Design a protein around this ligand. Structure first.
Ligand code: QUN
Ligand code: SAH
Length: 280
């Protein structure tokens, strides 16, 4: 329950969705410019679609490119809370008339296992996995599987933090000191591009600057600041349980240019995102 609420707090204190919106406005149109060619139905598969904000922006661009074409947007999302929010959002929208939504409460692995419980693999015209590969156990198998589901002229979009983000510096230096867990992998676009290269898949990668306002993290007692610390360290009650020296060290590094930039009296952690477009 806190994972989702924690992520929402992060979104509320970062330009993440704004960054993605910038990408969807500037780059997506060209990227999805042919996924619907010759088709009377466009199938979009959203893996880890969460609350649906980005999914809906993606859909608006596809609808704009293919007016009148029915769009089937299927979502693989294991969080009931996320699905509920997603449905709430859709229920408020009226400018997505050619779209049919379907929500499957399951992980991508369960989805994968099941689709493989049939005779024919279902093909898709656009598949996206936005900010969710960190929670997949077997990334190479996941990448290979979903790529295999791409139909003609289809594309797969994956988004994760960039190897040049502050996350990369944080994980490399403090990674081992943080609570390790297969449930969450510390991967960046560098890890993903290497896996894609080894898989022999063709792709294009675009990096976009994004920031996480961690100003409150330097205000002791600050509720938001403390919850963001938990987020950054993926440790519940970090300031209340972490070693006084580790906390002191982190507080210092998170202020360095390698991790953040200081402007307008605020500390902006480098949240540069990588948008990877994989070809069928
Ligand atoms: C760039 C940072 N990003 C990727 C590592 C992760 C932020 C993770 C935060 C939100 N916590 C999360 C987790 C933390 C620890 C472990 Cl063991 C498993 C986790 N699973 C999560 C699944 C969904 C989620 O979205 C609703 C957030 C999660
Ligand atoms: N194994 C898995 N397969 C599919 N989705 C998963 C998953 N593990 C976690 N998720 C989902 O991955 C999402 C990560 S946060 C997603 C945010 C959304 N794509 C957007 O960018 O705003 C959450 O909604 C979470 O429940």
């Amino acid at each position: 329950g806190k994972y989702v609420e924690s992520f929402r707090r992060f979104l509320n204190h970062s330009t993440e969705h704004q960054c993605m919106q910038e990408f969807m406005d500037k780059k997506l149109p060209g990227i999805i410019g042919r996924i619907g060619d010759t088709k009377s139905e466009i199938k979009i598969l959203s893996i880890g679609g969460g609350a649906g904000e980005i999914d809906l922006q993606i859909l608006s661009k596809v609808q704009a490119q293919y007016p009148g074409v029915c769009i089937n947007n299927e979502v693989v999302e294991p969080s009931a809370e996320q699905i509920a929010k997603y449905k709430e959002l859709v229920a408020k929208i009226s400018n997505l008339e050619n779209v049919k939504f379907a929500w499957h409460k399951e992980t991508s692995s369960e989805y994968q296992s099941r689709m493989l419980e049939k005779k024919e693999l279902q093909k898709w015209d656009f598949i996206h996995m936005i900010q969710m590969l960190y929670y997949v156990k077997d990334i190479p198998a996941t990448l290979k599987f979903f790529h295999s589901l791409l139909g003609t002229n289809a594309k797969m979009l994956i988004i994760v933090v960039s190897g040049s983000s502050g996350w990369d510096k944080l994980w490399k230096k403090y990674g081992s000191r943080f609570p390790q867990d297969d449930l969450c992998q510390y991967i960046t676009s560098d890890d993903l591009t290497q896996m894609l290269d080894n898989l022999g898949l063709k792709y294009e990668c675009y990096d976009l600057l994004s920031t996480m306002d961690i100003s409150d993290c330097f205000i002791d007692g600050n509720e938001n600041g403390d919850l963001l610390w938990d987020f950054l360290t993926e440790t519940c009650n970090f300031n209340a349980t972490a070693p006084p020296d580790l906390r002191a060290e982190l507080g210092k590094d998170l202020q360095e240019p390698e991790f953040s930039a200081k402007k307008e009296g605020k500390v902006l952690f480098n949240n540069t995102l990588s948008f990877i477009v994989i070809e069928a």
